């Protein structure tokens, strides 16, 4: 007699050669990395494998809306490498630029958080049902093809709708982090400066480089310049 | 004094799909669909058992060229298309 056991073992038809490497996922085309949530190589998979979908590419936004040249600004700043959101000033000393670390970090954390939500460990499937068939068997085979093809077309919708919603929310959250940053400094100098209508603040008082840095790091006391800025606005 | 505010921008970015826009440009994106393959089945971690010249049922019965597969455990038995049966002609209802 044969010894009967029940476990993770399975069978699969494949002509791909065997190599001395490591890979949780295995396909008839060859082992593929399961670091991505979905795959398009083959519907027959063994082990921890990504979900098979009809789409060949599904880009997930890990960055923000890109505007290089011609909402509030005419374009984004290509010279920023130290962060996503930053400041620029034309003061008495010269012209400088610096990034806001908190707003950049807060936008990265939201993307890093949902990025984990999309790549969470995929399904681990071992012995399933055969999806490729050598010859026509009739009613039973027609159902097996229908069961799987239904699962594929449903997953393809679940994936393609996911990237649309996640990226729509990605652009919304990153664009709102700048609206909140512009609103942050907008509250810093209430009536000490006015919104020029393009993303720039016209500070009507004498503000040096250290004064600009006081606005950047959040130590700007408007009462010091309120007696000066208000005079320059209406006179 | 003037204090302008803005965001960073890449010289060339990636296009993504959204609810409203099919082709909208962003600074960075990642691919979620695994489309490339090494072409080779990694023998680890799953205990891969190459079927080589016979099927699983041929080794279960005891075909002469499949005496090596006796008492062999496997996490995944891989049947080759180059398989054949050399012993007595049989059929499994």
């Amino acid at each position, epitope marked *: 007699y044969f010894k009967m056991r029940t476990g993770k073992s399975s069978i699969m038809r494949s002509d791909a050669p065997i190599d001395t490497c490591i890979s*949780e996922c295995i396909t008839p085309n060859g082992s593929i990395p399961n670091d991505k949530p979905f795959q398009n190589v083959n519907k027959i998979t063994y082990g921890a494998c990504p979900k098979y979908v009809k789409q060949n590419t599904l880009k997930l936004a890990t*960055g923000m809306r890109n505007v290089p040249e011609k909402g509030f600004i005419e374009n984004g700043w290509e010279g920023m490498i130290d962060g*996503w959101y930053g400041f620029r000033h034309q003061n008495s000393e010269g012209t400088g630029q610096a990034a806001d670390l908190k707003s950049t970090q807060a936008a990265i*954390d939201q993307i*890093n958080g949902k990025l984990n939500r999309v*790549i*969470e*460990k995929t399904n681990e499937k071992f012995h399933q049902i055969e999806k490729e068939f050598s010859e026509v068997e009739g009613r039973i085979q027609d159902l097996e093809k229908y069961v799987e093809d239904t699962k594929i077309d449903l997953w393809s919708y679940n994936a393609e709708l996911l990237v649309a919603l996640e990226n729509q929310h990605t652009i919304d959250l990153t664009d709102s982090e700048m609206n909140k940053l512009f609103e942050k400094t907008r509250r810093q100098l209430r009536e000490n400066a006015e919104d020029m209508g393009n993303g720039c603040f016209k500070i009507y008082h004498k503000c040096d480089n250290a004064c600009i840095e006081s606005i950047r790091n959040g130590t700007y006391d408007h009462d010091v310049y309120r007696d000066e800025a208000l005079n320059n606005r209406f006179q | 004094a003037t204090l302008c505010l803005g965001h960073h921008a890449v010289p060339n970015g990636t296009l993504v799909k959204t609810i409203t826009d099919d082709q909208i440009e962003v600074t960075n994106a990642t691919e979620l669909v695994q489309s490339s393959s090494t072409g080779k089945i990694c023998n680890n971690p799953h205990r891969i058992l190459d079927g080589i010249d016979c099927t699983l049922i041929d080794a279960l019965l005891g075909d002469p060229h499949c005496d090596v597969f006796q008492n062999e455990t496997w996490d995944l038995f891989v049947e080759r298309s180059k398989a054949f049966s050399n012993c007595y002609p049989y059929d499994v209802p």
Partner: antibody
Amino acid sequence: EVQLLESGGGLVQPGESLRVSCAASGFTFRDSALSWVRQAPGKGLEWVSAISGNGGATYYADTVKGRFTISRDNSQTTLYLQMNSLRADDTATYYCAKDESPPIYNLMPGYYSTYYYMDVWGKGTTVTVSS
Amino acid sequence: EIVMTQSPVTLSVSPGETATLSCRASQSVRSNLAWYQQKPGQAPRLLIYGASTRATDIPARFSGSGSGTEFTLSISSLQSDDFAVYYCQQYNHWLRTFGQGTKLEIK
């Protein structure tokens, strides 16, 4: 070599302050994050705090949330940790460790990637809090 | 704010046998779970990170597996120098927590 060495530590009375240094040498360009991990004599490990490239942390364990403050000096490539209002249970071998994330995370290189594991551990400095 | 519980506190395993460790975790955690081998009188050493995936130039006998809540660590071919203590951390709640620790004996 990604060697890093912890200096300082010793005997303190309860209620005192202590700053422990961590000279980050080697492969770490120090746009990567760093953390502090203490283990009490005979007790299990415990993550204390973390710091990112530049000042994206913050991030302190609830045991030391109000007591400890982590600092970073990239110009001299040294990680600090000012341990104020030390209590008796703060006696531990404070390890300094580099933090690494999966490459899919960490969008901008300098900022904090919220999913870190410690790969490079330091030699550790022993801090005893007693009378 | 997310406790980890290793089981058992200490296990005795003969050299050569496989030693399976447990790291039960409240709440859900998948993307990160690092295993460490802290030998007495030394700093911890990274073995596995994010579960499953092992660290650089560590032996292939150290296997990691786990989905959520329940996580395991099995040492295939056990050596006499493996008398270290094993810990498990995770993500996130922005706050990484360590495990209690699992002492491993030989013979």
